[PDB]
Design a protein around this ligand. Sequence first.
Ligand code: DKI
Length: 295
Amino acid sequence: LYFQSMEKYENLGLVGEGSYGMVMKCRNKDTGRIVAIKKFLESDDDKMVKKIAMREIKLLKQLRHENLVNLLEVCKKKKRWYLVFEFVDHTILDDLELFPNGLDYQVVQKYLFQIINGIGFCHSHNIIHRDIKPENILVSQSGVVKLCDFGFAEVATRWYRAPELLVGDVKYGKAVDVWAIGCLVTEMFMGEPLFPGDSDIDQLYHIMMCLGNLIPRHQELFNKNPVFAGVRLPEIKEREPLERRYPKLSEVVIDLAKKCLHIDPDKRPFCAELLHHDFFQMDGFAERFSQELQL
Ligand SMILES: Nc1nc(Nc2ccc(S(N)(=O)=O)cc2)nn1C(=S)Nc1c(F)cccc1F
């Protein structure tokens, strides 16, 4: 773990103009290339957290894929460590600012294909993201998706959280990322969030209005938790299915979203199985696009 110097970097702005906190957009004075810099460790005197930080850096160095943000170097200034990543030119929210009523069908296919490839690679290594959202789906000048801000390195948005996260189930796994992917499908097509809750309970209400009652395990976790004393989740006798909410979306798109958003985590597809879906396979999109990305 060679540490490099922060002296070669000059501040251009904050990445996202504050919406990400203290993540500095910087230029390398020697090469002209642009980076994102985030503080990683407050003090390397603390030998306990030091060891944990070095473990995480080792993972970041090994976890290399075309759809993951590139860690370039680790810098040390005094006792603090900073991670320096390749700066990626925009995010999917930038696309949606230009097109606030939704993106082009083929644009959605290309972005979801790459998100799935990136998450699938992580899953193949037993790495869960756990915090997928539009603000961490970066997009290069050439349209390559770069994922970032994995849940291994509040008023935090709950909009993409699966039911198992919302009730605090310790048995969550890879299926949380498939759920978040499902949330992205309608949002990229329609230009609005699927389930924009403002708390754990509100989020659950939004989910349940559409998708019905939770699995028994999850309802039990909710009902046994003292934090939710005095509050109940709704009985749903009449839900509002996705196709009623978005009657102009094709059946193929709705079907993909519905599979990802199964209320039972065990009945969601594996991330990699998503690429088998008609949404990607129709007209040979998938083979054609794969060959394109290589070439
Ligand atoms: N490496 C990298 N490039 C970018 N680019 C980017 C991000 C936001 C925006 S925006 N849409 O203008 O706020 C434009 C470009 N963000 N980025 C990182 S790692 N962003 C990031 C993040 F997405 C989440 C948490 C911490 C972070 F540092």
